[PDB]
Design a protein around this ligand. Structure first.
Ligand SMILES: [Cu+2]
Ligand SMILES: [Cu+2]
Lengths: 656, 656
């Protein structure tokens, strides 16, 4: 049996992966199978907490697998008990399709380049038959197409042309969309538009230094360096995957889908170690495009569930992606053959300056009496590439006890062809000649499993409101009175809430069993998040049905085990009909969520209307949200940090 | 005559200040006068642009002054022509009161400590008569009190007790409020509550290291250092107050009121130097409190117009407030005697790493084909202290051509006393025993005088909207279609708009005379700003009347000279009645603002519901907004910056 991990939440080692895939091959001996997913099945929440805090049973070390079998529809999935090298649960799911791996994305180009119907369309589009090596595709999942459902595993090949291998292809989309059976390795259909648009004759819109020298004359000279050193080392301590820093303690996990998973998050409040979150991660996304024209409705990528923030994560880049003194973690997955694969340097961990933590000075001696303390932040990060997009993910811990998630979006716009006299608006932007960059949103589902100061939690909306008493009344003489209206969610239905600019809405995750001795309020972490777009696709749309979580900024449901992925476990090609994922968890909306084990799913992101500044490669666009302690502590928790400068009134008088 | 400045927008030198005050003293010879304000009167916008870009006349170098005269109500104000040492304009304003200086804050404590009625109240409150040296006050402007109007110059002494001079006084407010005549140096009234609350007998809530060692046992050890150096110097160049960095060029100005003023802001687009803004600054604030109980309606500080972001600015570190390699500017004002005073190191300028600028990698070779470029940002900052508050102001320029304003709020909560059995809610929070920190908002008025790619500009609201065609229609078959609805403001009235979470509203400031050759849209800078609270005080309230700008997120008016301060030129003790400031500029709402010289005033900020984490000293709370180029450039303007790492497809194949 494989050696068991240092910690029950540690991701599967390479040896554990191989042990799992050997087990599964033996169970299916005589069958031709391929591996889609081999990943840790995390322990039940109860089992973990009981092991960690109550001297309870050691949870079994289990691997979840998804396989395909040649000639069989759908997938099989199950669990392997690693200690006994045995399959302990298995089932066949003939009517779902699974996440697409890097191998799956790389496989489609050879299919389309050799398909006679595709060749014919390249030629009709102005690319000669002997130049197929110049044709490339981003082979998305089909997403959903009602002509096939889940009956075949399908990709849509978004086709482009490169004049030279070093080109950025996105200036030269083609007009047609081959549909490919991923498992049969064949083109089954090609969507061809009513109006044909041949390949752009313009130069490629390129962005490496050699290209830029041709385009603008010269690169800027190298700027003088800004160097960042920690000559006495770092202040954080890692014990395997467990982090300790500035009184925070937590486990850094990682998987094929979510990427970074932070677990067992506590804060050491002068010797009282107080839980905050059991688990926090990104659980799904949707990137819905806004052109109604066929087949563009199929562009609504659920990037986490369809590609994976782990599978697609970048090996980060000795001193370029992450600047400073860095601790790296590697990621391990299975390939289709059942062999472990490694992404080196998938996670970067470091501490960085974060400006001022607090300051106050006294006007009475011209600010001679003064105290200033600088902030340090701890950053746990990854960058994943989902075809054209780059998503830079930064989990940030702060010395006031706040935790923030910062995202920067970069990469390249998804582009489609635009005719010489064709107008892109209102659904997209002409960002370069013959290039239409369609409107789209990027929405994310943050999953919080809280344990604010322990178990038994609730959530609330907090709305700023003027007093209901009018100006000139004895209760509100001058019309200034205002308060925070807290609406505690009692049932699931109550939770289904949007951000509201009219009230500056925030949400509290709180422990109703405890009370701050000063304020009288429950200890809480407050979600402060304003990048909360409405879902623009209509009710009942394909987008709305496949992402039931995205229609509210906040969804709060009862905890149950295995409630991770809110668009279901196998996302590609689901029509959005059925009681699964968030739609299952919400149910009829009547279940209790007050003072219990809850899961808080937050929808946040941006609406992107492309502009030429975004092309050919887009400058980073920031998204953030923060979880802030409010009524958790009885005073500013950073005041024991040594100030950078401190002078008292008495000391200022003595300096004369 | 004083030597003329290097640049017409340079603030008055110390010699110019003295020259101006000598001129005014001579004009008023035989009269007993004191100086309130002596500051640059900036050139008219037409005159500046003509001088800068058209070989036009050199604008006269002018000083604006505000003086008080013993025995005369209100103020006198006027202009001095420095070249001729003469008063060129003067007028008496008998019914206004002016900004309170540092000297004016410092003067009140000696008055109240020696006043028999105040002493009596201290004794009734539990502080013996021989301990008046332990009584302190923050002597705000009265703000507005209908019992006196502007008929006397008045301060309200928010009173506190210190057990030792090194204490933070804010745990020990007293229950009463002396009203002080600033110019007569006497207490004229004391507001006494119906419910007396004697001084707290608790320990002070303190925050220096010596205090914290007593409170929690020990300070944390010094963390290992993070060192930032620039061994080959910085990439920016300053010529006097003119900055050049990453193709931006602008003038760094400073005054008593607004603090930092950025002017003549352009971007050098490969040799084509394109204007962006004529002037950008913070022009006013309001910090309205939410307790209706008398006299707390008088807490609605207009910090900029009542105290001044320049007058109240901190002399910065060095090495503590601003980390790294810093260029500092000093600030110069007049004191009451007409002598120049200096705040050393009032502004800090430096460049800092700002993470990734952009990245893209190709999945086809497992991300071997990759380009990553790191961002640098340029930061122009100050910190001002308005009694209890600290406001950290950062104007940030970025290498994608965006400009951001970042603010961090810190300092100390304003507190009032709380009885042992008194409930603070719903209008405040008990943050420590016997301490009530009332609810309040912090609202700011960002003033933008734009020149987007030159003169003749417009503004618009941009709202994301679903297509009006329903799901299932030929126009919107799958219900996903969406667009940006642009509402161009034709008249002032049209511009009076709020942030709307329902549409993810942004605003464009654009040049309708020009067209992006790719997109077809006008060049613009887009305001991306979501920390846009409603004003919670009711229509017709004292707050809403004194801050007419604050009731909309956006106000756009025609440019005229001297339209700087949207709550009027002399803010303290204005009732809010009258056609002045923003209310004058809005007029009847009918004036054209489409394709003309416009002023864009943006209201943003936060609503603060205190919690114990904020006490006794508050961790920094961030506020931000961004102005982003959209359709300004025809491609990402940063692509000529040398990448940190770049490998092409061909290079990756050659590396084997
Ligand atoms: Cu996008
Ligand atoms: Cu505040």
């Amino acid at each position: 049996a494989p050696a068991r991990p240092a910690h029950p939440l540690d991701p599967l080692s390479t040896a554990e992966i191989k042990a799992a895939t050997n087990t599964v091959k033996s169970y299916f001996a005589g069958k031709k199978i391929s591996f889609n997913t081999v990943t840790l099945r995390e322990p039940a929440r109860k089992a973990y907490i009981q092991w960690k805090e109550q001297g309870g049973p050691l949870p079994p070390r289990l691997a979840y697998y998804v396989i395909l079998e040649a000639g069989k529809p759908g997938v099989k999935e199950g669990l392997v008990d690693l200690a006994s090298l045995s399959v302990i649960e298995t089932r066949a799911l003939e009517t779902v399709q699974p996440i697409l791996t890097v191998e799956d994305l790389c496989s489609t180009e050879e299919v389309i380049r050799n398909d006679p119907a595709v060749i014919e369309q390249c030629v009709l589009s102005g690319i000669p038959a002997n130049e197929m090596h110049k044709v490339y595709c981003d082979p998305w999942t089909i997403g959903y197409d009602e002509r096939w459902g889940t009956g075949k595993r399908l990709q849509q090949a978004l086709v482009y042309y490169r004049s030279d291998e070093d080109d950025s292809q996105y200036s030269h989309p083609l007009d047609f969309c081959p549909i490919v059976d991923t498992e049969e390795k064949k083109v089954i259909f090609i969507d061809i538009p009513n109006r044909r648009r041949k390949v752009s004759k313009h130069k490629h819109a390129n962005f490496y230094p050699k290209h830029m020298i041709e385009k603008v004359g010269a690169m800027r000279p190298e700027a003088p360096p800004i160097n960042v050193t920690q000559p006495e080392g770092v202040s954080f301590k890692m014990t395997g995957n467990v982090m300790e820093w500035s009184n925070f303690k937590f486990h850094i996990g990682f998987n094929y889908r979510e990427g970074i998973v932070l677990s067992d998050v506590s804060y050491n409040d002068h010797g009282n170690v107080r839980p905050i979150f059991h688990r926090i991660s990104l659980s799904e996304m949707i990137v819905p495009y806004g052109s109604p024209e066929f087949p563009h409705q199929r562009k609504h990528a659920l990037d986490i569930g369809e590609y994976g923030a782990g599978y697609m994560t970048n090996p980060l880049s000795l001193g370029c992606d992450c600047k400073g003194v860095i601790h790296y973690l590697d990621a391990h997955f299975s390939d289709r053959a059942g062999d472990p694969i490694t992404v080196k340097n998938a996670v970067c961990i470091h501490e960085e300056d974060d400006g001022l933590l607090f300051k106050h000075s006294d006007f009475r001696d011209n600010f001679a009496t003064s105290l200033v303390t600088r902030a340090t932040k701890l950053v746990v990060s990854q960058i994943f590439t989902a075809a054209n997009y780059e998503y830079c993910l930064y989990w940030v811990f702060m010395q006031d006890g706040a935790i923030r998630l910062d995202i920067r979006l970069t990469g390249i716009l998804n582009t489609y062809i635009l005719g010489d006299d064709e107008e892109a608006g209102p659904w997209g932007t002409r960002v370069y000649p013959n290039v239409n960059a369609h409107n789209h949103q990027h929405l994310f589902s943050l999953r919080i499993d809280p344990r604010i100061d322990g178990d038994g939690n609730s959530a609330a909306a907090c709305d700023a409101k003027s007093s209901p008493y009018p100006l000139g009344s004895p209760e509100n003489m001058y019309g200034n009175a205002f308060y925070s209206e807290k609406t505690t969610f009692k049932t699931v239905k109550d939770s289904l809430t949007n951000y509201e600019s009219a009230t500056g809405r925030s949400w509290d995750i709180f422990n109703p069993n405890k009370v701050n001795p000063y304020s009288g309020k429950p200890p809480s972490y407050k979600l402060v998040s304003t990048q909360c777009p409405p879902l623009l696709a209509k009710e009942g749309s394909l987008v709305a049905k496949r992402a039931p979580w995205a229609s509210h900024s906040v969804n709060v449901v009862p905890y149950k085990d295995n409630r991770l992925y809110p668009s279901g476990d196998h996302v590609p090609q689901w029509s959005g009909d059925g009681v699964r994922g968030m739609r299952e968890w919400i149910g009829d909306g009547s279940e209790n969520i007050d003072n219990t084990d809850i899961l808080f799913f937050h929808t946040f992101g941006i609406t992107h209307f492309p502009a030429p500044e975004d092309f050919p490669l887009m400058p980073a666009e920031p998204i953030t949200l923060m979880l802030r302690p409010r009524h958790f502590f009885t005073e500013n928790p950073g005041l024991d940090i040594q100030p950078s400068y401190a002078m008292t009134t008495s000391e200022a008088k003595r300096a004369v």
